[PDB]
Design a protein around this ligand. Structure first.
Ligand SMILES: [K+]
Lengths: 124, 71, 105, 88, 106, 71
RNA sequence: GCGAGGAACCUCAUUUGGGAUAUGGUGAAAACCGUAGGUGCUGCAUGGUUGUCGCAGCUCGUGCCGUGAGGUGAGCGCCCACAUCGGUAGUUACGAGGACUCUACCGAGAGUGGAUGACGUCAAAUCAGCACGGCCCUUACAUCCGGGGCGACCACGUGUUACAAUGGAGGGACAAAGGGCAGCUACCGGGCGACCGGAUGCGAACUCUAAACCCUUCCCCAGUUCGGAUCGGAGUCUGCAACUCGACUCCGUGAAGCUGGAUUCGCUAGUAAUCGCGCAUCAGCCAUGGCGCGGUG
């Protein structure tokens, strides 16, 4: 029916339903070419498909939270682990390029007595 | 400025004294000068003294404390 | 990190050097506009090869590359002009021609 | 601090509660030549939020009615229910 | 917590209403009573009693104008491994004395 | 017809033991005050006050510190 | 940019003056008339809290060495949050993919941030948060109220805007985390606009939350379509009252300012630099401050 996976990056959660088809990636009931108008953002989301697989899958994506770079990176991670479920022989091809590893870095909390996290007031 | 729905802020006791009216002493520094005040000597408090003010038509529409500096 | 139009990490590193204020797509647009101007005005090889040759014309190899990129960007800012890309294209053409205040400085 | 401070605060609260009805009746209408006949203490604009026990007029907290120093003292002592100390 | 009531976004008129033997507080008050009665330093008797009836570790700190001297001082009296806590105030003719008591056996 | 019971306290173990259940998100408040009683700023500590809420439903028909709303 | 995380009145301690120790009339009010307390002194008398020293060595016993001052077996140096996956819950969340809140393992193979601070010197700070030894005020250093002051005019510290094309303006397209709601507000019109006047949900997984970015056009190096100080006019709120001395919205006016000498300050990654959003106190607000939250990086 639909191979399912999830991706997270900063405060952005992506859900992928990969089914057999011919391209036509739809995100949030909107086309991928109209939801992400930047060619860099479309290259990140559709990166692992071109690494191995494009034009042979129909993908529906639900996005929530974060910004445009957070969501595009979160969407890339979700697709990467959805492709390894379809074939267990594609794991080394995706890990070598560094696609299945989740980056856990999130915005650090602001410590008291300082205007920012690691920035201190000017002493002089 | 004071909203037009409320009208001018004129002290009722000072207005009554002026209408019934010698220099008239007062502490009403925030009272707005009305056209009925014209021709009168009002001694406004300033903190330690009573500065006299002779009301003329040009001053109409200004607070009484504008013509009595404190510092 | 891969470049979005060429796929070379050197382009991404150069855009990182160019980056101001945390705005990276602006630096990418400036670099691509300068690479287009380097072909529209003057211009043998492609724009990417010309830029690589200019970098070569302008100690660890990584440190050498970083200092070359920093010098090129600094002298691009130093030279006059209205648009930053319109300026920087002059540095690429001038480093290809091996002249100017940028070379050997 | 002091005692006259608390005494006049209580007097102001009593006068405000006494005159809370006529002031609202005059304010709902357009009357203002009589709204200035009320005593200045009767208006609720002269109601500062002092600490309930010490009487400090700064650093007030609305939830507990106490200043920050008293809040820290009672939170360390366990007197305030629920409030704990963050482990981080 | 000492108080176990529930206050939902409102604690006023409730905190105000609240305001209006190896047990830490009891031994602290005993030491304060001895200090008010001028029985010197008291803390040695408390430590001996705790060790006699089974305290793993006891620490006592006394601060203030000890023995009527014109200077302040804080000395520790620690017995046991010490690998709960109480505070007491004694009003003497030379001022106020603060007694901090720690028992680590529980 | 149904009866919904909403429990809320400041102790998760207390509400869990009281409720003999959908766990609602908690409401955590953070208070920041100066450690010193005087001008020494930039030295603060954080006090957390948490509220835990639970919901249960009975279709077609407690320790201190818990408030329960029945609807 | 501190106690102060809300000085128009009150706070208020400071100054000048008037008092005291049911209705009328007189009054600026307090008040008048008839029918124990100290926010006073002493932090070099204190308790309790705080900052620094900024820290690896702090104590309890035996023997031995020295005429002596001295030298040399036991007690002590974790927690919270974030990542991955695996079992239970389903409403005001989207029948179990996420959220939400409870548990269990987490490299012998192919961590970070924060809080704890036994170990400390500064006669370090705090009698104005709070108690308190001593001294000094009682016809006044006590007490009530109006009107003023804490906001008046060269040096230093801390910041906010800029000095511009990696930019300003106009018109369209974007998609967040946390935190508030007797107050925020769905919707209709008076309005250029600040918000007023009719009504609607909501005491809380109904209501306030984006901008930087992505397109299109103008400006083309000009003290300018940069900049937004100062000053004149109109107003909208709050409040008994906005003159000294509030915020906001329109219309004008348009200042210094061309990237900054000697020197000096902050950090080593979701970090600096940037962009917006929220909260505490609060009728209103001086909030460009303090405390947090997320985007790109
Ligand atoms: K007030």
């Amino acid at each position: 029916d639909y191979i399912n996976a999830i991706g997270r990056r900063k405060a952005a959660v992506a859900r992928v339903y990969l089914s057999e088809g011919s391209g036509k990636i739809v995100i949030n009931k909107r086309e991928i070419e109209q939801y992400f108008p930047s060619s860099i953002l479309q290259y990140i989301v559709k990166q692992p498909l071109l690494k191995l697989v494009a034009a042979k899958y129909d993908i529906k994506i639900n996005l929530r939270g974060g910004g445009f770079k957070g969501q595009s990176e979160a969407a890339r991670l979700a697709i990467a682990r959805a492709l390894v479920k379809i074939n267990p022989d594609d794991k080394p091809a995706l890990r070598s390029e560094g696609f299945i590893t989740r980056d856990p870095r999130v915005v650090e909390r602001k410590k008291p007595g300082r205007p920012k996290a690691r920035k201190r007031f000017q002493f002089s | 400025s004071r909203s037009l729905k409320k009208g001018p802020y004129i002290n009722l006791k000072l207005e009554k004294k002026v209408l019934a009216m010698a220099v008239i002493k007062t502490w009403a520094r925030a009272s707005m000068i009305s056209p009925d005040f014209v021709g009168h000597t009002i001694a406004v408090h300033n903190g330690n003294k009573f500065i006299p003010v002779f009301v003329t038509e040009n001053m109409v529409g200004h607070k009484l404390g504008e013509f009595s500096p404190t510092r | 990190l891969p470049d979005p139009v060429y796929g070379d990490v050197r382009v991404t590193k150069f855009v990182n050097h160019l980056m101001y204020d945390g705005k990276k797509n602006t630096a990418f647009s400036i670099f691509y506009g300068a690479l287009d101007i380097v072909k529209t005005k003057h211009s043998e090889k492609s724009a990417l090869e010309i830029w690589k040759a200019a970098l070569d014309n302008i100690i660890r190899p990584e440190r050498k590359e970083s200092i070359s990129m920093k010098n090129l960007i600094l002298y691009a800012r130093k030279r006059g002009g209205k648009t930053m890309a319109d300026k920087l294209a002059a540095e690429i053409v001038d480093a290809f021609n091996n002249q100017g205040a940028a070379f050997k400085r | 601090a002091k005692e006259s401070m608390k005494a006049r605060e209580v007097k102001r609260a009593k006068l405000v509660a006494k005159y809370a009805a006529k002031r609202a009746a005059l304010k709902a209408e357009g009357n203002y030549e009589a709204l200035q006949l009320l005593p200045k203490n009767a208006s609720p604009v002269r109601l500062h939020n002092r600490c309930s026990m010490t009487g400090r007029p700064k650093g007030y907290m609305r939830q507990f009615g106490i200043s920050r120093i008293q809040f820290r003292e009672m939170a360390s002592a366990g007197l305030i229910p629920g409030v704990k100390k963050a482990s981080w | 917590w000492d108080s176990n009531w529930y206050g939902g976004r409102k604690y006023g008129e409730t905190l105000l209403e609240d305001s209006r033997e190896l047990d830490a507080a009891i031994v602290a008050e005993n030491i304060a009573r001895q200090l008010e009665g001028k029985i010197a330093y008291a803390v040695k008797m408390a430590i001996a009693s705790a060790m006699r009836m089974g305290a793993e570790g006891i620490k006592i700190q006394v601060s203030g104008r000890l023995n009527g001297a014109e200077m302040a001082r804080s000395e520790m009296f620690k017995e046991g491994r010490t690998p709960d806590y109480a505070l007491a105030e004694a009003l003497t003719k030379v001022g106020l004395l603060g007694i901090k008591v720690w028992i680590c056996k529980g | 017809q149904k009866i919904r019971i909403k429990l809320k306290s400041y102790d998760y173990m207390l509400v869990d033991k009281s409720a003999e259940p959908i766990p609602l998100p908690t409401h955590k408040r953070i208070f920041t005050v100066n450690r010193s009683t005087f001008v020494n700023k930039k030295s603060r500590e954080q006090f957390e006050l948490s509220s835990y809420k639970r919901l249960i439903d009975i279709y077609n028909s407690l320790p201190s510190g818990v408030e329960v709303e029945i609807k």
